mmCIF file of C-alpha atoms in Angstrom:
data_model
loop_
_atom_site.group_PDB
_atom_site.id
_atom_site.type_symbol
_atom_site.label_atom_id
_atom_site.label_comp_id
_atom_site.label_asym_id
_atom_site.label_seq_id
_atom_site.Cartn_x
_atom_site.Cartn_y
_atom_site.Cartn_z
ATOM 1 C CA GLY F 1 -30.804 -29.275 39.729
ATOM 2 C CA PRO F 2 -33.175 -27.184 37.535
ATOM 3 C CA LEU F 3 -33.480 -24.462 40.227
ATOM 4 C CA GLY F 4 -29.772 -24.404 41.081
ATOM 5 C CA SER F 5 -27.679 -23.901 44.235
ATOM 6 C CA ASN F 6 -29.282 -25.130 47.459
ATOM 7 C CA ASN F 7 -31.948 -26.218 44.958
ATOM 8 C CA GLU F 8 -34.862 -27.311 45.705
ATOM 9 C CA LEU F 9 -38.616 -27.368 45.922
ATOM 10 C CA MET F 10 -40.461 -26.351 42.757
ATOM 11 C CA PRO F 11 -43.775 -24.466 42.993
ATOM 12 C CA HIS F 12 -46.611 -25.294 40.600
ATOM 13 C CA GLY F 13 -49.118 -22.942 39.026
ATOM 14 C CA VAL F 14 -50.526 -19.649 40.196
ATOM 15 C CA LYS F 15 -54.126 -19.545 41.330
ATOM 16 C CA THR F 16 -56.474 -16.835 42.538
ATOM 17 C CA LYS F 17 -59.193 -16.645 45.201
ATOM 18 C CA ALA F 18 -60.889 -14.030 47.376
ATOM 19 C CA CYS F 19 -59.671 -13.336 50.877
ATOM 20 C CA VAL F 20 -59.926 -10.548 53.414
ATOM 21 C CA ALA F 21 -57.321 -8.078 54.654
ATOM 22 C CA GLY F 22 -57.090 -5.068 56.954
ATOM 23 C CA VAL F 23 -54.835 -2.469 58.524
ATOM 24 C CA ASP F 24 -54.528 -4.859 61.491
ATOM 25 C CA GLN F 25 -55.578 -8.425 62.355
ATOM 26 C CA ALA F 26 -58.597 -7.347 64.365
ATOM 27 C CA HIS F 27 -59.972 -5.511 61.358
ATOM 28 C CA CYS F 28 -59.662 -7.623 58.184
ATOM 29 C CA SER F 29 -62.746 -6.201 56.534
ATOM 30 C CA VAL F 30 -61.346 -5.448 53.095
ATOM 31 C CA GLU F 31 -62.148 -8.083 50.473
ATOM 32 C CA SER F 32 -59.064 -8.707 48.403
ATOM 33 C CA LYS F 33 -57.573 -11.100 45.892
ATOM 34 C CA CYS F 34 -54.858 -13.550 46.964
ATOM 35 C CA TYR F 35 -52.355 -15.423 44.791
ATOM 36 C CA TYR F 36 -51.245 -18.913 45.693
ATOM 37 C CA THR F 37 -49.128 -21.638 44.247
ATOM 38 C CA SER F 38 -48.818 -25.331 45.012
ATOM 39 C CA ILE F 39 -45.738 -26.765 46.717
ATOM 40 C CA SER F 40 -45.501 -30.459 47.679
ATOM 41 C CA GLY F 41 -49.226 -30.934 47.023
ATOM 42 C CA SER F 42 -50.118 -28.068 49.307
ATOM 43 C CA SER F 43 -51.367 -24.545 48.665
ATOM 44 C CA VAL F 44 -49.014 -21.689 49.595
ATOM 45 C CA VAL F 45 -50.451 -18.150 49.669
ATOM 46 C CA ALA F 46 -47.857 -15.727 48.277
ATOM 47 C CA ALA F 47 -49.458 -12.327 47.792
ATOM 48 C CA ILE F 48 -52.640 -10.290 47.886
ATOM 49 C CA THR F 49 -53.797 -7.431 45.661
ATOM 50 C CA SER F 50 -56.029 -4.505 46.560
ATOM 51 C CA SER F 51 -57.017 -0.940 45.699
ATOM 52 C CA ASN F 52 -56.264 -0.136 49.329
ATOM 53 C CA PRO F 53 -52.596 0.881 50.042
ATOM 54 C CA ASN F 54 -52.804 0.603 53.836
ATOM 55 C CA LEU F 55 -53.214 -3.116 54.404
ATOM 56 C CA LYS F 56 -51.010 -4.911 56.919
ATOM 57 C CA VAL F 57 -52.584 -8.300 57.562
ATOM 58 C CA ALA F 58 -54.359 -10.865 55.375
ATOM 59 C CA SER F 59 -56.694 -13.695 56.281
ATOM 60 C CA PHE F 60 -57.878 -16.919 54.696
ATOM 61 C CA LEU F 61 -58.423 -20.636 55.298
ATOM 62 C CA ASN F 62 -55.495 -23.017 55.301
ATOM 63 C CA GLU F 63 -55.195 -26.603 54.036
ATOM 64 C CA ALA F 64 -56.836 -27.891 57.217
ATOM 65 C CA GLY F 65 -59.776 -25.549 56.570
ATOM 66 C CA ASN F 66 -58.818 -23.263 59.467
ATOM 67 C CA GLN F 67 -58.903 -19.423 59.649
ATOM 68 C CA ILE F 68 -55.394 -17.955 59.779
ATOM 69 C CA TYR F 69 -53.732 -14.537 59.682
ATOM 70 C CA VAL F 70 -50.512 -13.513 57.904
ATOM 71 C CA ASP F 71 -48.402 -10.339 57.944
ATOM 72 C CA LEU F 72 -47.801 -8.366 54.747
ATOM 73 C CA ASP F 73 -44.622 -6.753 53.410
ATOM 74 C CA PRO F 74 -45.100 -3.183 52.239
ATOM 75 C CA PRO F 75 -46.927 -3.085 48.871
ATOM 76 C CA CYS F 76 -45.555 -2.700 45.301
ATOM 77 C CA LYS F 77 -47.816 -0.714 43.035
ATOM 78 C CA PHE F 78 -48.781 -1.446 39.438
ATOM 79 C CA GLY F 79 -51.086 -0.214 36.724
ATOM 80 C CA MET F 80 -53.021 -3.326 35.671
ATOM 81 C CA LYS F 81 -55.282 -4.108 32.714
ATOM 82 C CA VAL F 82 -58.830 -4.692 33.954
ATOM 83 C CA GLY F 83 -61.081 -4.911 30.898
ATOM 84 C CA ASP F 84 -60.773 -1.710 28.837
ATOM 85 C CA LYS F 85 -59.743 0.069 32.043
ATOM 86 C CA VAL F 86 -56.304 0.533 33.636
ATOM 87 C CA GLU F 87 -56.244 0.589 37.437
ATOM 88 C CA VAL F 88 -53.753 1.199 40.207
ATOM 89 C CA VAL F 89 -53.305 -2.077 42.097
ATOM 90 C CA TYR F 90 -51.312 -2.612 45.305
ATOM 91 C CA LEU F 91 -49.526 -5.935 45.525
ATOM 92 C CA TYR F 92 -48.488 -7.224 48.941
ATOM 93 C CA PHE F 93 -46.329 -10.277 49.352
ATOM 94 C CA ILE F 94 -46.815 -12.238 52.496
ATOM 95 C CA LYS F 95 -44.078 -11.974 55.159
ATOM 96 C CA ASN F 96 -41.201 -14.382 54.431
ATOM 97 C CA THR F 97 -42.465 -15.668 51.111
ATOM 98 C CA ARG F 98 -39.726 -17.506 49.199
ATOM 99 C CA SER F 99 -38.057 -15.474 46.425
ATOM 100 C CA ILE F 100 -38.988 -17.944 43.705
ATOM 101 C CA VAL F 101 -42.604 -17.845 44.865
ATOM 102 C CA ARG F 102 -42.594 -14.029 44.822
ATOM 103 C CA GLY F 103 -41.286 -14.178 41.265
ATOM 104 C CA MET F 104 -44.003 -16.608 40.255
ATOM 105 C CA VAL F 105 -46.670 -14.076 41.206
ATOM 106 C CA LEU F 106 -44.806 -11.326 39.333
ATOM 107 C CA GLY F 107 -44.471 -13.590 36.322
ATOM 108 C CA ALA F 108 -48.176 -14.484 36.397
ATOM 109 C CA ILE F 109 -49.308 -10.848 36.311
ATOM 110 C CA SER F 110 -46.684 -9.519 33.899
ATOM 111 C CA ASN F 111 -49.078 -9.980 30.949
ATOM 112 C CA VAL F 112 -51.455 -7.627 32.675
ATOM 113 C CA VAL F 113 -49.053 -5.026 34.107
ATOM 114 C CA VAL F 114 -48.901 -1.853 32.007
ATOM 115 C CA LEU F 115 -47.415 0.705 34.445
ATOM 116 C CA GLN F 116 -44.726 0.226 37.126
ATOM 117 C CA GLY P 1 -39.394 -3.558 51.382
ATOM 118 C CA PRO P 2 -41.911 -5.197 48.976
ATOM 119 C CA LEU P 3 -39.518 -8.112 48.249
ATOM 120 C CA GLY P 4 -38.468 -8.609 51.872
ATOM 121 C CA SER P 5 -35.266 -9.602 53.702
ATOM 122 C CA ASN P 6 -32.033 -8.524 52.012
ATOM 123 C CA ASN P 7 -34.561 -6.956 49.625
ATOM 124 C CA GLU P 8 -33.875 -5.657 46.781
ATOM 125 C CA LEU P 9 -33.863 -5.253 43.043
ATOM 126 C CA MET P 10 -37.210 -5.791 41.322
ATOM 127 C CA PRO P 11 -37.344 -7.358 37.841
ATOM 128 C CA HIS P 12 -39.800 -6.040 35.253
ATOM 129 C CA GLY P 13 -41.734 -7.982 32.648
ATOM 130 C CA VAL P 14 -40.971 -11.215 30.871
ATOM 131 C CA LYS P 15 -40.056 -11.072 27.210
ATOM 132 C CA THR P 16 -39.251 -13.638 24.551
ATOM 133 C CA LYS P 17 -36.775 -13.806 21.658
ATOM 134 C CA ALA P 18 -34.963 -16.432 19.592
ATOM 135 C CA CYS P 19 -31.485 -17.560 20.511
ATOM 136 C CA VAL P 20 -29.250 -20.531 19.837
ATOM 137 C CA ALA P 21 -28.114 -23.347 22.119
ATOM 138 C CA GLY P 22 -26.109 -26.563 21.923
ATOM 139 C CA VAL P 23 -24.676 -29.503 23.823
ATOM 140 C CA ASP P 24 -21.478 -27.436 24.155
ATOM 141 C CA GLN P 25 -20.330 -23.880 23.383
ATOM 142 C CA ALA P 26 -18.606 -24.838 20.154
ATOM 143 C CA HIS P 27 -21.850 -26.247 18.814
ATOM 144 C CA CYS P 28 -24.781 -23.893 19.522
ATOM 145 C CA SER P 29 -26.731 -24.850 16.434
ATOM 146 C CA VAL P 30 -30.144 -25.417 17.979
ATOM 147 C CA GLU P 31 -32.537 -22.486 17.594
ATOM 148 C CA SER P 32 -34.360 -21.980 20.850
ATOM 149 C CA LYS P 33 -36.539 -19.523 22.715
ATOM 150 C CA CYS P 34 -35.083 -17.458 25.568
ATOM 151 C CA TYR P 35 -36.920 -15.647 28.367
ATOM 152 C CA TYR P 36 -35.621 -12.379 29.732
ATOM 153 C CA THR P 37 -36.673 -9.753 32.180
ATOM 154 C CA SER P 38 -35.536 -6.193 32.777
ATOM 155 C CA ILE P 39 -33.529 -5.230 35.859
ATOM 156 C CA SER P 40 -32.200 -1.681 36.371
ATOM 157 C CA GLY P 41 -33.014 -0.786 32.756
ATOM 158 C CA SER P 42 -31.073 -3.749 31.459
ATOM 159 C CA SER P 43 -32.125 -7.059 29.936
ATOM 160 C CA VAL P 44 -31.348 -10.204 31.951
ATOM 161 C CA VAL P 45 -31.700 -13.578 30.194
ATOM 162 C CA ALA P 46 -33.175 -16.104 32.639
ATOM 163 C CA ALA P 47 -34.078 -19.273 30.767
ATOM 164 C CA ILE P 48 -34.361 -20.989 27.412
ATOM 165 C CA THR P 49 -36.915 -23.506 26.145
ATOM 166 C CA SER P 50 -36.432 -26.270 23.600
ATOM 167 C CA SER P 51 -37.691 -29.627 22.346
ATOM 168 C CA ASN P 52 -34.120 -30.831 22.785
ATOM 169 C CA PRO P 53 -33.307 -32.263 26.291
ATOM 170 C CA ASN P 54 -29.521 -32.315 25.863
ATOM 171 C CA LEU P 55 -28.616 -28.641 25.761
ATOM 172 C CA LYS P 56 -25.819 -27.309 27.952
ATOM 173 C CA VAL P 57 -24.937 -23.856 26.658
ATOM 174 C CA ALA P 58 -26.959 -20.940 25.271
ATOM 175 C CA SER P 59 -25.914 -17.991 23.152
ATOM 176 C CA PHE P 60 -27.240 -14.535 22.374
ATOM 177 C CA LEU P 61 -26.310 -10.853 22.135
ATOM 178 C CA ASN P 62 -25.911 -8.780 25.263
ATOM 179 C CA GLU P 63 -26.801 -5.140 25.973
ATOM 180 C CA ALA P 64 -23.607 -3.995 24.254
ATOM 181 C CA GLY P 65 -24.642 -5.970 21.159
ATOM 182 C CA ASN P 66 -21.933 -8.595 21.714
ATOM 183 C CA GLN P 67 -22.131 -12.408 21.265
ATOM 184 C CA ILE P 68 -21.949 -14.217 24.608
ATOM 185 C CA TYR P 69 -22.286 -17.757 25.952
ATOM 186 C CA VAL P 70 -23.973 -18.924 29.173
ATOM 187 C CA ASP P 71 -24.125 -22.278 30.975
ATOM 188 C CA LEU P 72 -27.462 -23.999 31.598
ATOM 189 C CA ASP P 73 -28.769 -25.785 34.696
ATOM 190 C CA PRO P 74 -30.308 -29.168 33.970
ATOM 191 C CA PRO P 75 -33.766 -28.778 32.363
ATOM 192 C CA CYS P 76 -37.275 -28.965 33.923
ATOM 193 C CA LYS P 77 -39.846 -30.505 31.641
ATOM 194 C CA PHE P 78 -43.403 -29.355 30.983
ATOM 195 C CA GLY P 79 -46.349 -30.101 28.756
ATOM 196 C CA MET P 80 -47.199 -26.732 27.187
ATOM 197 C CA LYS P 81 -50.188 -25.465 25.204
ATOM 198 C CA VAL P 82 -49.097 -24.654 21.652
ATOM 199 C CA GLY P 83 -52.238 -23.937 19.633
ATOM 200 C CA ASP P 84 -54.581 -26.950 19.779
ATOM 201 C CA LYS P 85 -51.511 -29.108 20.431
ATOM 202 C CA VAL P 86 -49.781 -30.049 23.702
ATOM 203 C CA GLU P 87 -46.006 -30.460 23.510
ATOM 204 C CA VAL P 88 -43.174 -31.562 25.750
ATOM 205 C CA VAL P 89 -40.952 -28.532 26.373
ATOM 206 C CA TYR P 90 -37.601 -28.491 28.194
ATOM 207 C CA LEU P 91 -36.958 -25.393 30.260
ATOM 208 C CA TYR P 92 -33.380 -24.530 31.188
ATOM 209 C CA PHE P 93 -32.553 -21.753 33.587
ATOM 210 C CA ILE P 94 -29.264 -20.051 33.080
ATOM 211 C CA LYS P 95 -26.492 -20.824 35.602
ATOM 212 C CA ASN P 96 -26.820 -18.651 38.730
ATOM 213 C CA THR P 97 -30.063 -16.949 37.807
ATOM 214 C CA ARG P 98 -31.631 -15.219 40.822
ATOM 215 C CA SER P 99 -34.492 -17.141 42.474
ATOM 216 C CA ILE P 100 -37.006 -14.353 41.952
ATOM 217 C CA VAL P 101 -36.066 -14.205 38.275
ATOM 218 C CA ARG P 102 -36.480 -17.983 37.937
ATOM 219 C CA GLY P 103 -39.927 -17.637 39.481
ATOM 220 C CA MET P 104 -40.845 -14.870 37.070
ATOM 221 C CA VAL P 105 -40.295 -17.207 34.125
ATOM 222 C CA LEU P 106 -42.321 -19.942 35.847
ATOM 223 C CA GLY P 107 -45.073 -17.455 36.583
ATOM 224 C CA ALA P 108 -45.119 -16.214 32.979
ATOM 225 C CA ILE P 109 -45.622 -19.699 31.526
ATOM 226 C CA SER P 110 -48.002 -21.051 34.167
ATOM 227 C CA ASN P 111 -51.022 -20.089 32.022
ATOM 228 C CA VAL P 112 -49.669 -22.348 29.332
ATOM 229 C CA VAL P 113 -48.366 -25.291 31.387
ATOM 230 C CA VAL P 114 -50.754 -28.258 31.383
ATOM 231 C CA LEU P 115 -48.497 -31.161 32.466
ATOM 232 C CA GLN P 116 -45.637 -31.195 35.008
#
């Protein structure tokens, strides 16, 4: 099909909302921005961004409105357009995110990435 | 690393240029738009878009400035913002494109996708 080999499930859109993150799960006190797409009518959180390079865990509500915690891969860094300013932003994908979903986040921010 | 399990190679940016496509390689007479990213300092063509739903083969120049042909997966369709108009656009990934690279194209156009 459209996505190829073992196919299958196509993700829709990239959205943004606040969340919290920390250097461990007991300390998610750093407000951050998370990226999520929709797969089979359900939200899937893919990545978070932050000025902080030391984050290890993110937290947010799930579909059922419950508070959950997810592990983070080590961060990529980018220079991103923020107004007339350029800032260093750390981008953390969530542990075990699908490759196509990782790409979707990268695609969504490419317009705004000016250093890498 | 940042992209996880068997890692590895991170794609950079999504760019756009004209190319040609057709229902077979001998007949690539349909001007189309291709999407490409950069991987290891080299351009990688990932997808083409077209109003035509019957395309099977795309053609363009490679890094070495040579004319090549690539097979297309079957197309996804989208309604895309084009000015004040909304149009049906067929999006074809190129045979065997990496999942993360497919996602990057989807991410890049998500801003502009209004039906799916």
